[PDB]
Design a protein around this ligand. Structure first.
Ligand SMILES: [K+]
Ligand SMILES: [K+]
Ligand SMILES: [K+]
Ligand SMILES: [K+]
Ligand SMILES: [K+]
Ligand SMILES: [K+]
Ligand SMILES: [K+]
Ligand SMILES: [K+]
Ligand SMILES: [K+]
Ligand SMILES: [K+]
Ligand SMILES: [Mg+2]
Ligand SMILES: [Mg+2]
Ligand SMILES: [Mg+2]
Ligand SMILES: [Mg+2]
Ligand SMILES: [Mg+2]
Ligand SMILES: [Mg+2]
Ligand SMILES: [Mg+2]
Ligand SMILES: [Mg+2]
Ligand SMILES: [Mg+2]
Ligand SMILES: [Mg+2]
Ligand SMILES: [Mg+2]
Ligand SMILES: [Mg+2]
Ligand SMILES: [Mg+2]
Ligand SMILES: [Mg+2]
Ligand SMILES: [Mg+2]
Ligand SMILES: [Mg+2]
Ligand SMILES: [Mg+2]
Ligand SMILES: [Mg+2]
Ligand SMILES: [Mg+2]
Ligand SMILES: [Mg+2]
Ligand SMILES: [Mg+2]
Ligand SMILES: [Mg+2]
Ligand SMILES: [Mg+2]
Ligand SMILES: [Mg+2]
Ligand SMILES: [Mg+2]
Lengths: 193, 97, 148
RNA sequence: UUGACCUCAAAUCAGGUAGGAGUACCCGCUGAACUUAAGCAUAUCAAUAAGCGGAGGAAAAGAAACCAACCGGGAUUGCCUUAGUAACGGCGAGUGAAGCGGCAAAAGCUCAAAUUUGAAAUCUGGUACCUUCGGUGCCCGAGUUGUAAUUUGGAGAGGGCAACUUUGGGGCCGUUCCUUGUCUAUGUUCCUUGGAACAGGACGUCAUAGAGGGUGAGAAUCCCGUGUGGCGAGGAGUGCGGUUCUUUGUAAAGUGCCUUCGAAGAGUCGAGUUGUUUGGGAAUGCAGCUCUAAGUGGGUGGUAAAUUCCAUCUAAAGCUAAAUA
RNA sequence: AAUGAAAGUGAACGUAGGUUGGGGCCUCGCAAGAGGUGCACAAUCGACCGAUCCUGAUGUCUUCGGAUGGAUUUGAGUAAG
RNA sequence: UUGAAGACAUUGUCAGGUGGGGAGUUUGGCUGGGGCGGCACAUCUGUUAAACGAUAACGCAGAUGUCCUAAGGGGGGCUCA
């Protein structure tokens, strides 16, 4: 069972795997159903859009923190800053999230902007009569798209202070590596008095 | 903190304009109220000490806090809990005198 | 498809191409990687040296995102300016309006130094840089701005 | 002696409820060996088959004692990825997840711990009446060893001050949704063969209908249907569009400022040890036994320990559509 | 984009090198040839990146930093994809 | 209710012993069949071996699992049966 110059393989089929094969023949059918359900939901809910308004947030980790994306819901602070209560906002198509905190003014200010633009571009019918024919827009996400913020300009003046980014990186790496030993030395020194 | 704006070293990371969010009341979980302070005092008076606590007060009296902590650790599991427990028994000893 | 297989051409030849003497039996040799230190040692030593035994240190709960640092050589670099704007910036080589190249936005974590850039100042934003990459950018009148 | 109370009984007492079936999928328990390792015991097959208990149209899970270490994300589930990877492993054979990212679907919340104390404000039953999936009187009873209102950590409560905003519940008629009924084109014209024309040839016709089936052989045009559109009947349900009756408001809710407070689940958590299990490695989860906490506490932060910080949630109580099977 | 167990570091001395071959093309020859240029590919000597072992400059949280230069060492590398 | 018994015993969890009563499994190879014997199973010298190298048999005659701070290294003087 080993022979020739071939890769070593790792095909995990030593259990009763044929009992649990899922072939997705319903791919096309599930797509028609999903679409019918969007249509059915849209009719039941009309003229409301099929989605709640969602905030912008920074993705976590060094790998994706360069991006912004839609988050779960607005903070209580952002909703208050936009001149709104959480209880009301939930009923007017805004997702609210009690867990997320604001620790960054840029993302906070941008989210407050989203809520203001939204309250401008909706019409809440009164809870009695009069109800004017509005016409249904299905996507809040398409109406209020998430823009990636701009970092810099296209071009500008070169400013060289002669420091060396490479040396800056090495020194920073070293300062971290010896912080602790250098604290111990500047205790064991200062103690003996 | 204040991040340095580079990708390594002590306070690595992007500098952004900070906010300071309002304190979540959940963070005061198990802070002593006046009600619980009072009830806990009363029930100690009624109920008194458990056998291991009595062994601990005797051991502080004779063999000192070092040996007490060693026993409290065995009895409670943690050293953090044993330190706290021997502290509590020191205050019971000090209140009687 | 079945019509082009040798199964079709073996129809009528007794042994189906597996021999009269040796035959096609079930698992002579054992299943899978059986015998790697015994009767399959020669294969393993010849084509997979290093297969048995341990080297190096374990790391529990390793998250690959921690190690994300895709590399870009200077060779490329000008590829990050769009092709429309590239030709103007190359002919108008100016310390006053050097293009900014955000290499993180482009999806890179470190500028390495392979090859040669045009003698045209550029501002390069990066998380990391090699020593030689920095020298080559500065020798073209550029700068490396470190970012996070 | 008479009457309570507590606890425990009896009745063919009044009214109910469980069992058994099915069992594809779902929630648990219990639990193999064949097999692989070219032998075999750990391992693998498999946390599978068989056995047992329990559900529904879905179940389960679920609004963080979460992930992280970022410029941070934000209930659960599922798909694409992560990845045949980190890790486990007679480090052999073999095994093997998670975080982030893209998507489908999206929905949030409830108790306990509080003096109504100027009024147990609460609720089952019986009984009479009524407009009966229920309502109103009246009467026993339950209940202070605590039933309502009020609050659930995102908070919130008690005082004090100042302001403006917003509301309920019926029928009736359309639409909706399901179940049904009915009506809605055009050759059976001639010749040949044949028992039979639905075959061949000729000349037409309808076509939003030339799907399919039947009829004495290959039939759009003989019949039923098909296509298009119309007209009925019967429910279900306010989902929501109109109309009509009653306007709940001395009520209810929301909001700013000041001030005093801020109750938050124990034989649990955690620890040791034993067994089992996991990719989880000085111990991933589960369980037995022993030990057994705290309140600026407690849990987690994937290498044991002490010391010092920091970050992040808020366990030991509970409900919840959809995407999935 | 490699390399290293890892922290990490990370690919032009030069016409992206020299030498020997090398199809085809170019020039001169009636032609034989002679000369030039030589892609792929082959052999060989170098250079470059990482590991290992040495060396240890200017500097300086006086123990950090690690220039420069080496080595019968090593890599599943670079050297117009 | 009446005797006994009494914080002992019993029961629970862990620990040491005992435990073919029972469970699971194993119990090399070569070989003039197999077994007994031997090792021709890792090896070394001479021969077989056919004057390069290779070369079989449970062919022939033997050896190995050690021994040595000198019995290793260098130099000097000397010469053995
Ligand atoms: K063959
Ligand atoms: K009954
Ligand atoms: K697992
Ligand atoms: K365990
Ligand atoms: K957070
Ligand atoms: K903490
Ligand atoms: K006893
Ligand atoms: K025993
Ligand atoms: K036995
Ligand atoms: K024999
Ligand atoms: Mg043949
Ligand atoms: Mg055969
Ligand atoms: Mg074979
Ligand atoms: Mg009865
Ligand atoms: Mg099988
Ligand atoms: Mg086997
Ligand atoms: Mg076998
Ligand atoms: Mg066997
Ligand atoms: Mg079964
Ligand atoms: Mg059912
Ligand atoms: Mg469903
Ligand atoms: Mg459920
Ligand atoms: Mg909560
Ligand atoms: Mg989540
Ligand atoms: Mg891959
Ligand atoms: Mg497994
Ligand atoms: Mg209220
Ligand atoms: Mg027919
Ligand atoms: Mg089990
Ligand atoms: Mg539930
Ligand atoms: Mg036996
Ligand atoms: Mg034999
Ligand atoms: Mg051999
Ligand atoms: Mg010879
Ligand atoms: Mg000698």
């Amino acid at each position: 069972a080993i022979s020739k110059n071939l890769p070593i393989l790792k095909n995990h089929f030593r259990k009763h795997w044929q009992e649990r094969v899922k072939v997705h023949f319903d791919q096309a059918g599930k797509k028609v159903s999903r679409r019918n359900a969007r249509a059915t939901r849209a009719a039941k809910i009309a003229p409301r859009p099929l989605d709640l308004l969602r905030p912008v947030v920074r993705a976590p980790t060094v790998k994706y923190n360069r991006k912004v994306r839609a988050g779960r819901g607005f903070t209580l602070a952002e909703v208050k800053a936009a001149g709104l209560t959480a209880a009301y906002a939930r009923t007017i198509g805004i997702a609210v999230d009690h867990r997320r905190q604001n620790r960054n003014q840029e993302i906070f200010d941008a989210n407050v902007q989203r809520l203001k633009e939204y309250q401008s571009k909706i019409i809440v019918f009164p809870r009695n009569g009069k109800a004017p024919e509005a016409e249904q827009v299905l996507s809040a996400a398409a109406t209020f798209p998430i823009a990636q913020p701009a970092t810099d300009v296209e071009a500008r003046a070169v400013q060289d202070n002669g420091e060396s980014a490479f040396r800056t990186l090495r020194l920073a790496r070293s300062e971290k590596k010896f912080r602790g030993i250098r604290e111990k030395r500047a205790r064991e020194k200062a103690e003996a008095e | 903190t204040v991040k340095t704006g580079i990708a390594i070293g002590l306070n690595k990371g992007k500098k952004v304009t900070s906010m300071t969010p309002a304190p979540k009341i959940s963070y005061k979980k198990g802070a002593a109220s006046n009600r619980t302070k009072f009830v806990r005092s009363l029930v100690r008076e009624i109920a008194g000490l458990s056998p291991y606590e009595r062994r601990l007060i005797d051991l502080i009296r004779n063999s000192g806090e070092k040996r007490a902590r060693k026993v409290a650790k065995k009895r409670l599991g943690s050293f953090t809990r044993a330190k706290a427990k021997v502290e509590e028994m020191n205050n019971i000893i000090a209140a009687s005198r | 498809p079945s019509r082009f297989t040798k199964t079709r051409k073996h129809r009528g030849h007794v042994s189906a191409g597996k021999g009269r003497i040796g035959k096609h039996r079930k698992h002579p040799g054992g299943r899978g990687m059986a015998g790697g230190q015994h009767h399959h040692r020669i294969n393993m030593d010849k084509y997979h040296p290093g297969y048995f035994g341990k080297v190096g240190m374990r790391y529990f709960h390793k998250q690959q995102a921690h190690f994300w640092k895709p590399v870009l050589n200077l060779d490329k670099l000008w590829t990050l300016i769009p092709e429309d704007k590239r030709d103007q910036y190359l002919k108008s080589a100016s310390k006053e309006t050097a293009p900014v190249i955000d290499t993180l936005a482009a999806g890179y974590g470190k500028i390495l130094g392979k090859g040669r850039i045009p003698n045209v100042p550029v501002i390069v934003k990066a998380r990391f840089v090699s020593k030689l990459a920095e020298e080559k950018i500065r020798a073209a009148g550029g700068v490396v701005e470190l970012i996070a």
